Structures are given as C-alpha cells and as structure tokens.
Amino acid sequence: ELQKQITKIQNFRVYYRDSRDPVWKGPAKLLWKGEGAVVIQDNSDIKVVPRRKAKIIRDYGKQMA
Amino acid sequence: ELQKQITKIQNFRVYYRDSRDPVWKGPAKLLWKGEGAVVIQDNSDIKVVPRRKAKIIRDYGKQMA
Amino acid sequence: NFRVYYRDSRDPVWKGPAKLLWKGEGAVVIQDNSDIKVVPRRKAKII
Amino acid sequence: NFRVYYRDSRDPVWKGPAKLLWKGEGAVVIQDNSDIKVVPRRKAKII
Amino acid sequence: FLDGIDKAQEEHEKYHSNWRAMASDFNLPPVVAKEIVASCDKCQLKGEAMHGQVDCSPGIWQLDCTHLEGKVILVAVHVASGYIEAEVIPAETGQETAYFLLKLAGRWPVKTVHTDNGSNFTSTTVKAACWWAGIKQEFGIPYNPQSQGVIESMNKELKKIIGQVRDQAEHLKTAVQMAVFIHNFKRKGGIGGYSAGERIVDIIATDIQTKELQKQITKIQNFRVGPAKLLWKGEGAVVIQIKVVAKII
Amino acid sequence: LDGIDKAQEEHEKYHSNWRAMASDFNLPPVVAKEIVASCDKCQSPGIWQLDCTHLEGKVILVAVHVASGYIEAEVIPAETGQETAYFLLKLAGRWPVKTVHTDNGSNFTSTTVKAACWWAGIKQEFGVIESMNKELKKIIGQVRDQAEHLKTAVQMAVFIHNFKRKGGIGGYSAGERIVDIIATDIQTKELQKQITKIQNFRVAKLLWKGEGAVVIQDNSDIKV
Amino acid sequence: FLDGIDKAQEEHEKYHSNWRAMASDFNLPPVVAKEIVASCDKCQLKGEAMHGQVDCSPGIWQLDCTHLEGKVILVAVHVASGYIEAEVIPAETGQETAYFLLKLAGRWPVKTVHTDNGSNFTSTTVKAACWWAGIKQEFGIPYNPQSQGVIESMNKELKKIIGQVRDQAEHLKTAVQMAVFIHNFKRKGGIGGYSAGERIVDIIATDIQTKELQKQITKIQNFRVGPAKLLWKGEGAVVIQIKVVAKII
Amino acid sequence: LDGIDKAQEEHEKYHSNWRAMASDFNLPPVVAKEIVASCDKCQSPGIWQLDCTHLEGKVILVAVHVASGYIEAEVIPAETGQETAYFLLKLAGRWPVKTVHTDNGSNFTSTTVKAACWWAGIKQEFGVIESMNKELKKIIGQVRDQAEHLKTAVQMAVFIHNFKRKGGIGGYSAGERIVDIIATDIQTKELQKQITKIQNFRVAKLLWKGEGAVVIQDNSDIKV
DNA sequence: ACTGCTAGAGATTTTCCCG
DNA sequence: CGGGAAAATCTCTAGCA
DNA sequence: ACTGCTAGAGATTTTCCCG
DNA sequence: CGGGAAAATCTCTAGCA
Ligand SMILES: O=C(NCc1c(F)cc(F)cc1F)c1cn2c(c(O)c1=O)C(=O)N1[C@H]3CC[C@H](C3)O[C@@H]1C2
Ligand SMILES: O=C(NCc1c(F)cc(F)cc1F)c1cn2c(c(O)c1=O)C(=O)N1[C@H]3CC[C@H](C3)O[C@@H]1C2
Ligand SMILES: [Mg+2]
Ligand SMILES: [Mg+2]
Ligand SMILES: [Mg+2]
Ligand SMILES: [Mg+2]
Ligand SMILES: [Zn+2]
Ligand SMILES: [Zn+2]
Ligand SMILES: [Zn+2]
Ligand SMILES: [Zn+2]
C-alpha cells in the first residue's frame, strides 16, 4: 500500500546545510520532498530545509544493511 | 624584602599563545621572566611559554582595583 | 529604513549610503542615486 | 629519514623529494640536489 | 556627559577614531560612541564577516572558462555532485559556449546554468541555446567569483589533475579529457564516499525516484490538519503546508 | 532475522531475485544474495555501440548505450582514428564505459583508438546501432530547419532523443533509463565489494555482522 | 589481497586515483591505499594545513615598503604592540632605508628588524646601519609575505586610514603622518584596550621593570632543587631550570 | 579594606603620595587618591621644547622632552614653516605631545605650524634646549667621522644620547626615562578617567565597588 | 531580486575488538 | 570494562586569477 | 636553521542589576 | 533566583599585492 512507499521515501538520506553554517550536516532521514522545501529528521529534530540547501541521495553503501 | 618584589612581578599580565593555536590566550599571571622563557599561571595551570610567544604588560586598567 | 555602504566592482573605494530594497542571505539589493545594484553581503554594511 | 615535497618560489610546480634537515614549527630546512632551502610548512609535505 | 558627546563628535570629524577610543577618552558609554562612529560615512569600510551559500539543486550546473597553455577550456560542474564536463574550445566566443551547453543539456538533465558575466555566457547565442533546451540562465554578481565558488574550485582541481597527466597525452584536449575521466571516476570521497559519476547518478536517480514516490504518496493521503494539508504524520509532530505543528481529518 | 527462512521458502516456490527478497523482508542484500545463490534452479550496463553515419557530407560518430538506448552523437571533421579516440575518451570520461562494439572500420581498429581504450580500460569488441542511426537521422531531418550548422542540429536531435522521446515499458526517456541502469550497476558493484570483503572471514561462511548477532551459512544452512 | 595491491599500483600509475578510490575499487585497507598514494611523487601537491606564528618579542620590529599614489612609503611596526612609524621616502633605495632604520633605532629600543627580501632591506647600506645601531637582521622566506604578516596587515590599515584623511592634507607625506598619529593614538582596542602608543609604552616599561625585578629576585633567592635552580616556588608546583616539577635547599 | 584608616594615619603623619599608599596597603588607587585629596597639607609629561640649530651650514630641528631629556633631531633642508609643521606632525604622531615651547622664530609662528598644532591638538607656547643643543652638537662632533652625510651623523648622535648616555639619579638613559614618564602619565590619565566615571554616582561619594562591598566617603569620612 | 568551495593533510574524537 | 588500533570526524589551507 | 595578522561586524555566551 | 540589558568573548573576513 502506501506505508511501504513512505518507508521507501524515508530510506533516502539528506545532506543539508543551515543558513549561516558553511559545513554540511549529516545524513538526515528524508520524510517529505517538495518542489521548494524538504522535510528531514536529523537527531530526532524535524527540520524544513530549502530545496537549494539539500543533497538527497540513496547512499548505495546501503548494500551492507 | 623579596616577597613584595615577587608579588610585584606577579602583578604583571601575560597574553601568550600555544604552538598551534592562532588565538591569543587570556591574561595569565607572570611568575617568572627569563631571557628565553616565561613562566605563567593561567587557569591554575603553570605553563612555560617561549619568550617569542608572550606579550607581557601591566594593564594600566589596574587603576580600578 | 536602512543605510547601506557597499563596494561595487573591482573598486576599492566604498560608496553610500544607499536604500536597502531587499535583504536575502548572501546578497542584498540596494538603490543608490536612482541606480539599482545587487551587492554581496560581504561587500555591504547595513545600518 | 624523511622525504619532503615542497613549493619553492612563485612556482606552482612542486619539487621533491628532499632530505629533511630541520623541522621547526612554521618552517622546515631541507636539502634538495645539493642545495639547502628553507620552506614554510604550508608549502611542504613530509612523509 | 552630553558635552563629551559634542567633543567626541568634533574630534571624530578630525581623527576618525573608533568607538573604543572615543568611549575611553571622553567617558562615553559604548552605545553613544558606536553611534558616533556609525554616523560617519568615511568610517563604513568593512562588510559583514560571513559567506553566502550557492544553490546546489540537482538541476543546476555552473560553467566557467579557464585558460591553460594558451588555450581555452570551458568547464561545467554539477553543483550537487561535482561531476565535471570540460572541453578545449577553439575560442572563448559565445557561439562555442552555446554548442558546449546544448551538448551538455542533451547529455544530462540540465535545468539551470549559473555562470559569471563573461561575454561568452552573456551573449545572445547562449541565450537562444538555453531558451531552446529549456535551461534557466543565472548570472552571479559582477566581479564576485565566490558566487561560482564550486566551478572555480573545480577549475583548480581540473588543472591539478592535468598537471598529473600532461605527459601521458600529446595534446592538451586529450589531457583535459583524461582529467575529466580521472575526476569523475578515479577520485572518491564526499557525501557518499562516491566518485563524481557515482554521485551524479545517485543524485539524479534519487530525484526521479523520490519525485515519483511523493507523487504516489500525496495522491493517496488526503487529510486536512486553518485547513492545511498533511505532509507527514509523526509520533510527536505533524507537518502541514511548511511548519512542524492537531485535528487531522 | 526472522524472515531469512521465510524468504528461503519464497525463493523455493517463487524464486524472486535478491533485490525483491531484500527490501520486502528487511534482509541485508548479502543474506538475500546468498539465499538466491544457494538454489539449484537459479544457477550489459557498460556495453556501448559505436558507428559512423554520413549526413550532408559530414561524418557523425554515434554511440548507443545498448542497455537503455541512450544516444550520444558528435559531428567530427574527419573519419580518422584520432577523432574516434577523442570521442571514445570523452565518452569514457562522461559515462562508465566498459565495452565498445564497432563495425571493424578503418577508424576503429587504428592504433590510436586501441591506445585510448587501453588507457580508459575499455574492452574493444568487433542491430541496435542501425535502428538508432535511423531514428537519429529522422530527428535530425525533423529539426534541421532550426539550426544553421549540422553540429547543432545533431546536438538538438540527441537532446530530443535522450529527454523528449518517451516510450518503452513504463513511459520513461532514454536518460532516465540510463541513469536507473547505472544506478543498479553501482548497487551491483557495491554488493560485490561487500561480498568479497567478508569471504576472507571464517566463523561457517560469514554473511552479515549486525549489532551483536552475526549471520552465518553453516552446512549450507543460513543460521543467525 | 596483495594481488589487489599490484593491480592498484598499476592503475595508480595511470589515473593517480586517491587512496579512497583505490581502497574501494580493489578492496584495500586504508593504510595500503594511503601508502600507494604516498609513494607516488606526482601526488604530493598539497602542504600542511596550518600556519606559523611570527616572533613577537618586545624588541623585534617589522619593516616593509608599500606604494601609494606612485610614492614609496617605508613603514615599520612594533610586532608586540602595533606601534607604527611610516615615512614617505623619495626612492626605495637601501640608502634611504638605512636612514629610516637608524632614525627609528635612535627613537625606540630596536633589537631586531624582520623584513622581506626586498633589495632595499638586503643591501650593504642597511646591513652597516644595523651593525652600528646593534640591530639584528632577520629575513623571511623568499616570496612568503606571511612571515611579515604583521607589517603587511598594518600596511592595509595604514592605507585605510590614509583614505580617511587624504583630503585633510595637501601632500601625501602629511597624510601619512596623520595616519600614523591616528593609528598610534586615536584607535583603541587590543590586548589592553590600549592604543598602539599606550601599548608600546606599557610593553617597554614592563620589559624594563620586570627585568630589574627578576635581576633583584634571583640575586636574593639561592635554593637548589640533579642540582637545578629554583625559579619559582608555589603551593602545588616548583619550577626549576625549564620544567614544572622536590628537595629545595 | 582594613588599611584605609591606617593609610589615613600615615598620610596624617608622613603624607605619602597615593601611589605609595595604594601598593603598600593593597588599596584601589581611587581610595588612596581620595585619602590624599582629603588632607589640608597636600592641597609636565607632555611638554616638548623645539629649536633650530645650525651646523655645517645645515639646519637641524631639535625637540627635547623637558621632563626626561629624550631628544629628537632632524636635519631639514630649509628653515621654513612647512618643514617645521612636518617635523611637529611626525613627533606628535610618534609621542604624546601636548605642549610645544618655541623661541618665537619665523618658522614657529607661521600659519602652517599653527594648523599642524591645531590638528594634532598641540598647545603652542612662546634653558633645557640650549644645554641639550650643546650636548647634541658635542656628540655630533664626536661621531661626525663615522658618517658621510650630516643627517646620518645627527641620527647617530640622537641614538647615542637617547640610549647610550646614562646618568641622572638612578643611572637610566633618556629612553628609559621617557618611557617611564609616559607610563606614569598613562596611569594618571586612567585614574582620572576612573575618578570621573564614578563622580556621577551618589550612594556619600562612591569610591569603589568591589565584590559586594562598596567604598563610600560619607561626611568626608571614608566608610567601607 | 542572491549567495564560496573542494580536496587533501594532520589532529582529535568515536568505535570496534578482543580479552 | 580497559585499553589499542582503526576508522570517522573535525580543523584549516591554497587555488580557482 | 622559521613562522599570518589585524581590526571591524555580527552572533553568542557571561556578567551585572535590580527586585 | 529570574530575567533584561549590557559588556565580553567568539567567529569570520578582506587586504596587505
Ligand atoms: O578571480 C577569479 N578567480 C579566482 C577566484 C575565484 F575563482 C574565487 C574566489 F572566491 C576568489 C578568486 F580570486 C575570476 C575573475 N574573473 C572571471 C573568472 O572566471 C574568475 O575565475 C571571469 O570570467 N570574468 C569575466 C566576467 C567579467 C570579466 C570577465 O571579468 C571576470 C573576472
Ligand atoms: O604579496 C604581497 N602582499 C600581499 C600579501 C601579504 F601581504 C600577506 C600574505 F599572507 C599574502 C599576500 F598576498 C607582497 C609581495 N612582495 C613584497 C611585499 O612587500 C608584499 O607585501 C616584496 O616586497 N617583495 C620584494 C622581496 C623580493 C621581491 C621584492 O618580491 C617580493 C614580493
Ligand atoms: Mg569566468
Ligand atoms: Mg573563473
Ligand atoms: Mg616588501
Ligand atoms: Mg608587503
Ligand atoms: Zn569617521
Ligand atoms: Zn532458485
Ligand atoms: Zn600518483
Ligand atoms: Zn596630606
């Protein structure tokens, strides 16, 4: 159904950045992907990162676990 | 005698730096001043700083206390 | 109301003041002497 | 024994290897092809 | 102490002393001295000590012309992955940049190109190529190369790799293509331990997959949480259309 | 964990590939790969095809990704070995090229192309290219009017073929198809790396070491 | 996996891939791949990511010639305090630098001058002036201006202040002296909230006072703490001749 | 603290300056300054002297710090107002010059020197300079042989006078004397700033606010 | 209304592996 | 749990010209 | 065997002042 | 002790050419 698809879209990792921190934050869990914003979960914190500030990848090092 | 002179030389402040930290550490208390080294007390830590790494001043803002 | 003092193009001198029309993160859009310019926030000071 | 690869004077190319004669904080003294040079540690890599 | 304010004004008109000197010399609170400095136009000579952040969407590229051995190398980078495409062009004309850019847009899904204000990129020829291929043209601040900090950086790396393979090739174009190969497939490290090619493939495949997944998700979920839209329902939070707030329907 | 023997039974009756048994049962890909590799019933992405087409008196190198149809064309000034080697080096730097199929032309068997393939690590081996030369020529004839030179018309045709012509099974374009194929290829290579990394270890073949529970293959029976 | 080591060697001879690419592609531990990279001369192209620290003794000065409006400004800075002395010189000859430096050494207690390798400072004329005045000549690494990072920085500031007072003076030398005045006495802030003049006075007076104080202290204290010398006896530590160690005599 | 009334008694009998009562009794300088300022019995560093000397047909501007003898000389090409203003601006930028004493020469009363003094904030007011011109001329005559031009000989004489000739009370040089005098001047200015900063406060004149114990002057009796 | 970054060299903190 | 070793993260720099 | 720094603009942590 | 405000410290950048 749709729960499998929600788990699938949560299987993706997001490397984001804040407005004034120049270093790339860790691989947050992608909860929702919009046209201009991206909802992530990083360290049990739900953030809304602009689309221009996020690199969303499915790290193919997922072939280990 | 000499205890007054030791207190006098301890009344001086030293702004030093470590070998790989580019920021100037706070005003340690000067315990001893040699030709090549300078013994300081910073945060209850007795350090031996090279002479080339220390700016020793008697901060004339000592006219407050 | 804000004043903006900026650095325009390969010119070491600073100009201003200029009216702040828009402030984004990274750059600003200002209006100086009926000319609209876009200056990075590294090359602009806002009062 | 060490190898030093350095950048000499306004020359973007890197040279080496060179024998490390002295390592201070900030700069090193090396010997390359019977010529002794003094290079900052920003412009030198030691193996 | 407002007479001290007048004296400090009249002395700053001469020496342009900073706020600390005027606060010490005329017994002024730091606010008053800072305002005396902030009212002088001649003392505003330093900008904000920060840096912006370039756009790193999965569809934006950054292009720049570099020079090596008296030849022009037009380079493009995928800002989100570091995947580079470089070509030795016969001239820095816009008619060659339009060809390079149309070729690139045919190879990869280019949605936006960010360039400096070089005549090559500012021309009507590159403007027509972008309109045809459907690309959006973005230009940085004039004479602010930090706006293109990605591609400029890649320039360096590209040249670096060329210096390591310049003697394996007889011509400069062959060495440039060797450097592109080495960067895209023989140098790993980054946000996934990837190479630039693996990373661009991951980025684009992920974009497509997540777009289709979300298009299928929103088509099923119909829950109003004012009457907003449910974006994601969690154990301790509820996202609406975007804040992280409930009366879910 | 609790789905290992279950997936073994499904593969006993349905014989699903490891990619299905992995994501459907939360199994690490190594475990599902050993499940599919322990059966008797169950025991490309880098192949390109090059050719030269002649149009308007110009020579066009056309390279097709046989697995996805993703085309890549370039109007070259001469049908010589140097320009073929340049095209091949460009392509190999752009995409993960592992094998090239050519029609035994004079410009494909030259020493320069051989050296380029040796450098880029390409295997040179001497039906799809014909059909896609026909399709590319049709698209060029369609969009020839919008171009002043033939090279830009060829690039426009390549753009239209790779990103505007959708078809196939699910209605995807050639670009989406090639990026998906290369993504699955990357997954396959990473899984092969993970499998080779733990074949040296003896525990009883090791398959996965999680939090504190190792996955073992003992007597060809997977035992967590 | 030592055959993987041979394959990685033979492939690094071609692509010069970094250690992570060779560790991923050939199943090599990070140490082996890093050693394969570290054995290639062509891959050593980056230096240590650090910075030195200039000598800031109370007797060392840093000198540099800057240029403004087609004229040469010879500037000197007290590295420990930021006290500057600048002069518009008719030429960049060493015969003028020797005069400036002898004048400075006559004004202040100059023990060491640190300069770049400009012909002005490298000459026999400045070498004789330093030998007479008893100054020690130190030269930075050739073409490494960071060794003079203090004075170069001051150059900037000096020019900056000149731009704020250029219209108050009719000549450039008057504006340079105005800038020296403003820097030394009208700009506060630093390690004491001082100006550069107050700071140099504090530095030098403190040097003299502490030298005499220590000369009087060591003349009285005679205590051996091997048989070292007692430098300072504390409640929880004892300094000897220099470590922070007892059997004090 | 416990030494306030004690120091009051010492100043009643010995009348030590505030610098003595401060460091000898651990008193804040404001408290000792109010102690010395509350007595009936007890109720320069920026003065320079300029002149022009003529030697070997050259003109030499000589500026003496009257408080310490620290000399500063410069061979100028002409005895005009412009070069005098330049010398004065140089000096004022180098040292804290507050007052200049001149011999009412044609080059000291010119409008340019007046403008330079107005800009640098110097007060121009129209015995030591004569003796130290004599001493500087003697040193120049001593070291004239070691110089090819007169300007370098003058600078050598200035060096020798400021750092090689030691005398006076404690055997210090002119440079040590001027740096000590300017240091005490800085201490005086900082103490005056501290005194002006807390004369606005009424508690009973405030004198010092330490950890949680304020120092007060009530009915002209200091009360902590 | 737009915007520094990237990869490498050391240093330092975190994690894993055996007892 | 106690370290040792190794991997992961942090810090910082040059060139892009 | 010698060596980036300095001052200013914001941001953020620390301290003080009244209840 | 509880904040608000203010001072002190931290972070980061350009120019030095
Ligand atoms: O300074 C440059 N690089 C070095 C550098 C950097 F990369 C990044 C930084 F943060 C700082 C840097 F110092 C640089 C300068 N220009 C151009 C470049 O591409 C370029 O890289 C360019 O093309 N134009 C055209 C557009 C108008 C005309 C022609 O002047 C500009 C000048
Ligand atoms: O690059 C310079 N400044 C800018 C800068 C800086 F200040 C500090 C940095 F960390 C980085 C910088 F980019 C600079 C270059 N040179 C000289 C300078 O004084 C000077 O400041 C100089 O005098 N010589 C002579 C000695 C041999 C000849 C003549 O070449 C050098 C070249
Ligand atoms: Mg450019
Ligand atoms: Mg560029
Ligand atoms: Mg110089
Ligand atoms: Mg310089
Ligand atoms: Zn001002
Ligand atoms: Zn099977
Ligand atoms: Zn190599
Ligand atoms: Zn009295």
DSSP states of F154-185: HHHHHHHHHHT-EETTTTEEHHHHHHHHHHHH
| Rounded distance from Cα E19 to ligand 7 centre (Å) | 10
Nucleotides, chain I, CB distance < 7 Å: 1-11, 17
Nearest nt to G146, CA vs C1'? Answer: K4
β-pairing, C15-23 vs C3-6, is antiparallel
> Is the separation of the CB atoms in D2 and D46 below 8 Å?
yes
Amino acid at residue number G201: V
Q: What is the CA radius of gyration of chain D?
A: 9
Residue E149 Cβ inside 6 Å of ligand 1? The answer reads yes
Which residues, including other chains, have CB under 8 Å from residue F117's CB and lie 6 or more apart? F88, F100, F123, F124
Hey, CA dihedral for F207, F208, F213, F214, is it positive or negative? positive
Looking at residue E175, what DSSP letter applies? H
**Which positions of chain K lie under 7 Å from any protein Cβ?**
1-11, 17
Tokens 């990473």 sit on residue = F190
Tell if the CB–CB gap between G52 and D40 is shorter than 8 Å: yes
Residue type, G17: S
Work out which ligand 2 atom sits closest to the CA atom of G146: 10
Nearest CA among E239, A33, E215 for reference residue A55: A33
Rg of chain B over Cα atoms, rounded to whole angstroms, equals 12
Which residue is it, tokens 């710090």? H65
From the CA of E11, how many Å to the nearest CA of chain G?
10
Q: At what angle do helices F150-163 and F174-197 cross, to 10 degrees?
A: 70
Q: Can you give the residue ranges of every domain in chain D?
A: 1-47
- Percent helix, strand, coil in chain D, to 5, is 5, 60, 35
Which residue carries 């004296």 as its tokens?
A: E7
Say which experimental method was used.
cryo-EM
Sequence-ordered list of residues with C-beta below 8 angstroms from that of G38, at least 6 positions apart, any chain:
D47, G44
The CA distances from residue G168 to F73, G165, G171, G186, H124, in Å, are 68, 5, 9, 16, 21
Alpha helices (H) in H122-202, listed in sequence order: 128-143, 150-163, 174-197
By the 10 Å C-beta count (0-12 exposed, 13-18 middle, 19+ buried), H186 is classed as buried
Angle at C37 between CA C33 and CA C43, to 5 degrees: 110
Contact E102 F159 (CB under 8 A): yes
For residues F20 and F169, what is the distance between their CA atoms, to the nearest angstrom? 19
Q: How many CB atoms lie within 10 A of CB F203?
A: 13
**Crossing angle for the helix pair E172-185 and F81-94, nearest 10 degrees?**
20
Instruction: Please give the structure tokens belonging to residue F34.
Output: 């050993």
Cβ contacts of G168 on chain H, cutoff 8 Å: 119
CB proximity list for E147: less than 8 A, separation 6 or greater: C40, E52, E54, E114, E116, E140, E141
Rounded CA gap, H205 and E106, in Å? 84
Ligand 2 pocket: which of G116, G122, G151 to mutate (most atoms <8 Å of CB)? G116
Separation in Å, CA of G120 to nearest CA in chain B: 26
For the Cβ of E146 lying below 6 angstroms from any atom of ligand 1, the answer is: yes
Note residues around ion ligand 4 (Cβ under 5 angstroms): E 64, 152
Which of G56, G192, G232 minimises the CB distance to B59? G192
Q: What angle do CA F26, F30, F32 make, to 5 degrees?
A: 55
- Helix (H), strand (E), coil (C) string for G219-234: HHCCCECCCCEEEEEC
B37 and B49 in contact (C-beta within 8 Å)?
yes
Cα distance between residue A65 and residue G136, in whole Å: 66
CB G182 within 8 A of CB E13: no
E22-27: which pairs have CB atoms within 8 A and are 24 or more residues apart? Answer: E24/G188, E24/G193, E24/H193, E26/E1, E27/E1, E27/H193, E27/H196, E27/H197
Query: At residue F69, what are phi and psi to the nearest 5 degrees?
Result: 85, -5
Task: Quote the CA–CA distance of E233 and E223 in Å, as a whole number.
Answer: 10
The residues near E154 (Cβ < 8 Å, ≥ 6 apart) are E75, E77, E82, E84, E183
**Alpha helices (H) along chain E:** 2-15, 19-25, 30-38, 94-107, 119-122, 124-133, 149-165, 172-185, 196-220
Residue with tokens 């800057």: G66
Cα(F191) to centroid of ligand 8, in Å?
19
- Which alpha helices (H) appear in chain G, and where do they start and end? 2-15, 19-25, 30-38, 94-107, 119-122, 124-133, 149-165, 172-185, 196-220
Pick the residue of A41, A57, A60 with the most E CBs within 10 A to test the interface with E by mutation.
A57
The residue count for chain H:
224
d(CA E43, CA G160): 10
Query: How many other C-beta atoms lie within 10 A of the C-beta of residue H156?
Result: 25
**Inter-CA distances, H62 with E155, G237, H69, H73, H129, Å:** 60, 54, 11, 4, 8
Which ligand 2 atom is at minimum distance from the Cα of G66? 19
CA distance H46 to chain G (A): 14
G50, G53, G143 member nearest D42 (Cβ)? G50
Contact call for B32 and G50, based on CB within 8 A: no
Closest by Cβ to D42, choosing from G44, G48, G143: G48
Residue of H164, B2, B27 lying closest to G215 (CA atoms): B2
Count of alpha carbons within 13 angstroms of residue E181, beta-carbon side: 27
Q: In the Cβ-directed half-sphere of G244, how many Cα atoms lie within 13 Å?
A: 17
| Measured CA B64 to C1' L2 distance, in angstroms | 30
Strands E112-115 and E60-68: parallel
In this complex, the nucleotide whose C1' atom is nearest to the CA atom of residue C43 is L14
Rounded Cα–Cα distance for residues G189 and E34 (Å) = 13
For chain G, which chains pass the contact test of at least 3 CB pairs under 8 Å?
A: B, D, E, F, H
Name the pairing type of β-strands D35-40 and D27-32. antiparallel
Task: Assess contact for H62 and H50: CB atoms under 8 A.
Answer: yes
Cβ-Cβ contacts under 8 Å, E210 against chain A? 9, 12, 30, 33, 56
| Ligand 1 atom nearest residue E64's Cα | 19
- The verdict on whether omega for the bond into residue G145 sits within 30 degrees of 0, i.e. cis, is no
Which residues lie across from C30 on neighbouring strands? C20, C37
Least CB-CB distance to H182: which of G109, G174, G201?
G201
The first and second tokens of residue C20, run together, are 């702040």
In degrees and rounded to multiples of 5, residue F28 shows phi and psi of: -60, 140
CB distance F222 to F207 below 8 Å: yes
Dihedral in degrees, nearest 10, Cα atoms G72, G76, G79, G84: -100
Of the candidates G45, G10, G12, the one whose C-alpha atom is nearest the C-alpha of residue D16 is: G45
Cβ atoms of G190 and G153 within 8 Å: the answer is no
Residue with tokens 């004339």: B60
F176 vs E contacts (CB less than 8 Å): 208
Q: Is H102 left (phi over 0), alpha (psi -120 to 50) or beta?
A: beta
Nearest chain C residue to E42, by CA: C14
What DSSP element (H or E) covers H51? strand H47-55
Nearest to H46 by CA among H108, H112, H95: H95
**How far is C-alpha E89 from the geometric centre of its chain's CA atoms?**
24
- HEC letters along G22-61: HHHHCCCCHHHHHHHHHCCHHHCCCCCCCCCCCCCCCCEE
Using DSSP's 3-state secondary structure scheme, residue B7 falls into: helix
- Alpha-carbon distance values, H66 to F92, G39, H132, H172, H187 (Å): 84, 70, 10, 16, 19
End-to-end CA distance of chain A: 23
Which DSSP letter does residue F125 get? E
Contacts of G155 (CB under 8 A, 6+ apart): G64, G66, G75
Q: Which residues pair with A14 in a beta bridge?
A: A28, A56
Q: What span, in angstroms and rounded, lies between the C-alpha atoms of H5 and H223?
A: 9
Kindly provide the b/e burial profile for residues D12-39, where b requires at least 16 CB atoms within 10 angstroms of the residue's own CB.
eebbbbbebeeeeebbbbbebeeeebbb
Q: Is the CB of E145 under 6 A from ligand 1?
A: yes
Among protein residues, the one whose CA lies closest to atom 25 of ligand 1: E118
Q: Name residues whose C-beta falls within 8 Å of residue G76's C-beta, 6 or more positions apart in sequence.
A: G61, G62, G63, G84, G85, G86, G100, G101, G104, G113, G151
Interstrand relation of C3-6 and H99-101 (parallel, antiparallel or unpaired): unpaired
CA distance H66 to F47: 94
Report the residue of chain F nearest A61, measured CA to CA: F190
Contacts 24+ apart (CB under 8 A), F173-179: F174/F65, F174/F68, F174/F69, F174/F70, F174/F71, F175/E108, F175/E109, F175/F70, F176/E208, F177/F68, F177/F69, F177/F70, F178/F65, F178/F67, F178/F68, F178/F69, F178/F70, F178/F95, F179/E201, F179/E204, F179/E205, F179/E208
Q: What is the rounded distance in angstroms from the CA atom of residue B24 to the CA atom of residue B40?
A: 14
Residue bearing the CA closest to ligand 2, atom 29: G118
- Single-letter code of the amino acid located at H46: G
What is d(CA F175, CA F164) in angstroms, rounded to the nearest whole number? 9
CB–CB contact C45 E147 (8 Å): no
User: In terms of C-beta density within 10 A (0-12 exposed, 13-18 middle, 19 or more buried), how is residue A36 classed?
Assistant: exposed
Strand partners of residue H50: H63
Extract the tokens encoding H122: 């110097």
- Kindly give the interhelix angle for G149-165 and G172-185, rounded to the nearest 10 degrees: 110
For helices H111-120 and H81-94, give the axis angle rounded to 10 degrees. 10
Q: Which residue of E has its CA nearest to G157?
A: E45
Ligand nearest the Cα of residue C42 is 1
Is there a cis peptide before residue E109, judged by omega within 30 degrees of 0? no
Angle between helices G172-185 and G196-220 (to 10 degrees): 50
Backbone dihedral angles phi then psi of residue H92, each to the nearest 5 degrees: -65, -30
Contact (CB, 8 A) for E242 and E232: no
Helix axes F4-13, F29-37, angle to 10 degrees: 40
Give the neighbours of chain D: at least 3 Cβ pairs within 8 Å: G
The CATH number corresponding to D1-47 among 3.10.20.90, 2.40.50.140, 1.10.10.10, 2.30.30.10 equals 2.30.30.10
Q: State the Cα–Cα distance between residues F87 and F93, nearest whole angstrom.
A: 10
Closest chain B residue by Cα to residue H182: B60
CATH architecture of B11-58: Roll (2.30)
Task: Give dist(CA F82, CA F89) in Å, integer.
Answer: 11
Residues B55 and B12: their CA atoms lie apart, in Å, by: 10
Check if E117 has its Cβ closer than 6 Å to any atom of ligand 1: yes
